[PDB]
Design a protein around this nucleic acid. Structure first.
Ligand SMILES: [Mg+2]
Lengths: 106, 97, 95, 87, 95, 106, 97, 82
DNA sequence: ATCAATATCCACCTGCAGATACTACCAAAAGTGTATTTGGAAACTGCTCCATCAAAAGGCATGTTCAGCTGATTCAGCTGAACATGCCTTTTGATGGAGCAGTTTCCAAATACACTTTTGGTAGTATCTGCAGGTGGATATTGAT
DNA sequence: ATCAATATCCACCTGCAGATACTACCAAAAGTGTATTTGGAAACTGCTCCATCAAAAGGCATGTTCAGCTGAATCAGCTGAACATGCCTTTTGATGGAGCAGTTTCCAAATACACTTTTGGTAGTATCTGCAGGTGGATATTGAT
């Protein structure tokens, strides 16, 4: 008895994802490969964000990823920024950014 | 008696608040505003505390992002001072009108 | 005392793979959980629509693939597509 | 239940310093005196819209209590998706 | 050859009740059809979410009503709601 | 046999609306009154737009509603405009509107 | 010898084009552009006539509305002449940048 | 007399669009900026339409392909089906 | 002011592109009737967490002062609007053919269904640890001179 | 540039809130295995409707001229930043109690067929007409003097 996750070589739960596709009223039928492909996309995306967020945590001399690190990760990455362009990460704050003309002297 | 020049503490505050993530509006006053507005829609409502915090996080992130757009509208006008006309322009272009 | 599922343990697994010495706060985890559910909903939805538009009653890995191309920007799409193809190909050979 | 205080003018609990802080986070260096009332007005419209939909979800569910989830769904509806509260 | 359904006839009927001497071009009719399809999808979509949020398996007129309140502006919502309630009453009290 | 539309008092097809709800993967089940309600709402908004578009036709010395008239109807109405705030009516054009500062100095 | 002043014909044109609904880009050149752009995504594509039309209607509606925002952006800066920075600001605020 | 396809979107044509947009006065550099903007617009929309075409296994982009692409970009169009 | 160029308005005319009425038809809803499944309200009640309150901790309100920003004024020079027409690109329509779409086909993969194993969630009790917030104390940054 | 007020930056430092750790259980997943139905791919093809092109149409490239707009410069006036000062309001920890949510019982309403009737879409064909352009003539607008 090998899980469908181990069959596909995935950490993310293929069984859970198959189930959610059914209960979710997306179509009459769900193909067997659909939850496999989806669970991999989901796993890929979360690896991408944890990598970048992990880096922000290290850059900050921290060992624990907090919401600020997720925000720095997403906003500093062109593609994640666009994908979450209409999303708000609670307790993430903003990127340090001051417009040029606002700086003193000349 | 010592004095910083107008603009200097302002830039200090910008770096300070751009660095941190805490909510910037005091909790209770915000909670009262929420309850006042909700009550005008429907009497005898309760709120989970996380419901109030959700609204706070959303409203603060909405206001910060609007202020950035507003700042850009002022700068476009060759000013450094945000005015109501800047907010109004930003909201018009955004489709909030 | 009802059961509430989350992607937490899976997010944590994936976290250990990429940064073995790094932890995650519960709040960051909650955000990670929301992100997975959100992306799930957006892909399934595009897939749902796509299937309807082509008079199909079945959501297959092919629908999911087009949904991914529609939803993700350039380079994330390219890589997501390889990861998903790979998982399905592997999965097909493994029973 | 015996008595419950009247809620009025709570918009003013959004003080000048709190607004100034928010502008600072948005990168603003100089703030005209009329910004504070304009901002209060803008925030009110924003809250009315979100609370209305949130409360609608509450009533549909037949609860007396507005949940984090009611708010999260109200935000999603308006294209202001929020992560961090179960949504 | 395959059947292409449309709201055209029903829109033309409602036109005649509302302006009996006014006609409508093809292009305008096509727009009206899009409008009806669009509003349908928006309302059914919201109704779907509501039922799901509340762990219900049925889309009832209660869900349609809440959906309308969520989607239509003030006055538009008010009439839609009363038009809808009115139609459900007439339908009930009819053999 | 009497149709559900006639029963409900409507021009818009209850049967079709019911059918479309079923095969739309909206939920496992569809209540008896829901298609009745929804059809009524759809008919109502149709009447509203046709009312105002008919008028715009009249104002412009015409008996046939064209896309122009549908546009004028929608954008001159605060509520219809909001509902259709992210919609484009093909061959609609725009409202006549010039910013005052652009007017020649009298 | 007769000559209309700068802005007279422009005003006349605004009035004319705000009255009508016809497309304002010649069809052929737009069609070529459409095909050129599509070729980078897939080769040997054909287009339904109505497909190209749909694209033109959507593209013209988009550009017309963007010019409205752009114009508000010029006027905000106390000009009557639209400039690339006005288009730039409008797009940034819209969230397209 | 070879000419780029984008340049087929001519000054007078961009001038007309601006006019319907209520624009009185137009800077020389606007015409090139507009062309860039149109290109990004068409890229984003065509990309998605073609993606719909490929999914259906066609070699013809249909009005519906385009209408669906517009809908998902949040630029719903009425008049061509759907 | 007058005056003339030229745009704009309107009444009337009319061919035809596009709207509409009608018949015969058929596949396909939409409806009627009978057998069967189940979703969800109600009714009771465990128990989370919300409203509420007393004490403790720190941000807000206010007035004074003046730096420097905004908005008005003026001006020159640059830059876009207006202008007329034949070159040349687009539009129009006429014609072969590509592929979309309608039809039939048949099986790989879909749902269903019932015992069989596994596991993700919680729940109760325990020890662990990253870092926030306190401190002092050396190194900038800023603004007067 | 030099001096001095004050913000800033670490480095270390104790408490502890929040995170991580097991031991035990368990309801509901998820898997396994077999019987039953079917979606859609695959293959053939008819006929739209699409790319092409010849002849016709009519919009735009072009360079000149200068009106009037944009942006630089200058500056008075006053608004908004900074900071001192006095103290109210929020934050934080503790506690009876409303309503949410968990479980189970039971029926009104919905699905599932199959069969019976109709309606909405197409299609062939002929029939009809609102109004886009064209004309012709008065009248308004704009710009020159
Ligand atoms: Mg009140």
């Amino acid at each position: 008895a090998k899980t469908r996750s181990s069959r596909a070589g995935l950490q993310f739960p293929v069984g859970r994802v198959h189930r959610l596709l059914r209960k979710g009223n997306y179509a009459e039928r769900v193909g067997a490969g659909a939850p496999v492909y989806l669970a991999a996309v989901l796993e890929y995306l979360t690896a991408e964000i944890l990598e970048l967020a992990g880096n922000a945590a290290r850059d900050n001399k921290k060992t624990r990823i907090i919401p600020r690190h997720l925000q720095l990760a997403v906003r500093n990455d062109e593609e994640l920024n666009k994908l979450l362009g209409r999303v708000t990460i609670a307790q993430g704050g903003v990127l340090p950014n001051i417009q040029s003309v606002l700086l003193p002297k000349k | 008696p010592h004095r910083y020049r107008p603009g200097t503490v302002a830039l200090r505050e910008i770096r300070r608040y751009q660095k941190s993530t805490e909510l910037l509006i005091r909790k209770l006053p915000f909670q009262r505003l929420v309850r006042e507005i909700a009550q005008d829609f429907k009497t005898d409502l309760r709120f989970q505390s996380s419901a109030v915090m959700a609204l706070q996080e959303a409203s603060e992130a909405y206001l910060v992002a609007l202020f950035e757009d507003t700042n850009l509208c002022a700068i476009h006008a060759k000013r450094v001072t945000i005015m109501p006309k800047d907010i109004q322009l930003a909201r018009r272009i955004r489709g909030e009108r | 005392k009802t059961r509430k599922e989350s992607y937490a343990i899976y997010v944590y697994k994936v976290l250990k793979q990429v940064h073995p010495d790094t932890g995650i706060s519960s709040k960051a985890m909650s955000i990670m959980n929301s992100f997975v559910n959100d992306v799930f909903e957006r892909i399934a939805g595009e897939a749902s629509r796509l299937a309807h538009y082509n008079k199909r009653s079945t959501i297959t890995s092919r629908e999911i693939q087009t949904a991914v191309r529609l939803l993700l920007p350039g380079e994330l799409a390219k890589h997501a597509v390889s990861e998903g193809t790979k998982a399905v190909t592997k999965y097909t050979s493994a029973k | 239940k015996r008595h419950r205080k009247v809620l009025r003018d709570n918009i003013q609990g959004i003080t000048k310093p709190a607004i100034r802080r928010l502008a600072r986070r948005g990168g603003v260096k100089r703030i005209s005196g009329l910004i504070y009332e304009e901002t209060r007005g803008v925030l009110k419209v924003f809250l009315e819209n979100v609370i209305r939909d949130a409360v609608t979800y509450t009533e549909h569910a037949k609860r007396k209590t507005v949940t984090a989830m009611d708010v999260v769904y109200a935000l999603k509806r308006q294209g202001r998706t929020l992560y961090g509260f179960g949504g």
